[PDB]
Symmetry: C2
């Protein structure tokens, strides 16, 4: 955005009836489990669908508005951002990346799925380039996004984008346009587009 | 968003060196002319590219920051919204839809174009469905988007989306995901996805 950018857009189906919860101060928390699929044609020309399952967290006002009304099988449009969190030992891992929904909009499930992420930040390390047996290039890179704290996000790219990305270095700025995918558990971004935000100006010494 | 949603994402190339301008109060105004192209395969299986040329307006702070630095041929990432304006007789037409950039980020033009719009609003009229000689369905609909004033935007869809859309009526809510295109001059949205935001709740009489 002004440097750091973090935006997520999803349209998926609820795999479970929403779980409502309140904090002692009285903050409503509503977690939604969404599912959908992304397609792509492989090197053998085969059209393939890759499923994705993402938990989405709504907070407060809107969480209350939607609580109890949402049912399993419901088609939902979501707009939010990726939030990274780190902690000691308890919730099963030290770090986690979850989608925090800014707002949600249930859609008429007919009488369709969407998965897009836009990130802009700076590399927290040199890119890690590797190759597959077939000889396909793949890279892994860490991104620091700060638009109250910095969010550390993992990005993966393939083929030419992976080769171009391999020339980047720790500290470099990067704009990512891709999809939110999963993999212990890890949520990361699969890049569809990668671009370098130009720097610097106006050294009027 | 909360009902009204208006977001534009573009990556294009400057077709002309930016024109800076100030208002008497001292508000910097920077208009950028961007170009790019969208591809698509027709019914005859032919892969085709459709060009798009869009003026983008930056205001104030950022406009000043970028003024004079931007050159023709420069690749730029843009995020903003569509703004509709109406007036009497002077600037050549009564209404106009322009992209107002919230921020821009020049990108390294290598050593790619992007055109996406997300709208949510309510139909200002019944949809207008027509067919092409070949027999292809096409619809035109008016959308009122209010997230200080309402923005009236024209949307066009094709084939099945056009047929499904034809069942909508004035007042109905609609989520649009598409591309910004041009056509006197008219800027409108070509739909790639159309969905109906469910209504209503919680009548606890």
């Amino acid at each position: 955005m002004a440097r750091g950018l973090n935006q997520v857009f999803l349209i998926g189906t609820l795999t479970a009836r929403p779980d409502m919860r309140y904090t002692p101060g009285g903050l409503a928390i509503l977690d939604l489990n969404l599912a959908g699929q992304d397609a792509f044609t492989d090197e053998s020309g085969q059209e393939r669908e890759v499923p994705w399952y993402h938990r989405v967290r709504l907070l407060g006002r809107q969480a209350e508005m939607w609580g109890d009304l949402l049912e399993k099988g419901q088609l939902i449009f979501v707009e939010g951002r990726l939030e990274y969190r780190q902690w000691e030992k308890d919730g099963e891992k030290k770090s986690e990346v979850q989608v925090r929904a800014e707002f949600i909009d249930p859609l008429e499930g007919r009488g369709r799925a969407l998965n897009q992420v836009i990130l802009m930040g700076n590399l927290t390390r040199d890119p890690d380039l590797r190759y597959t047996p077939q000889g396909t290039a793949v890279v892994r890179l860490g991104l620091a996004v700060n638009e109250e704290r910095t969010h550390f996000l993992e990005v993966q790219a393939w083929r030419e984008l992976a080769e171009w990305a391999s020339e980047l270095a720790k500290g470099d700025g990067l704009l990512v346009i891709g999809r939110l995918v999963n993999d212990r558990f890890q949520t990361r971004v699969e890049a569809l587009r990668l671009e370098r935000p130009l720097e610097d100006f106006p050294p009027e010494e």
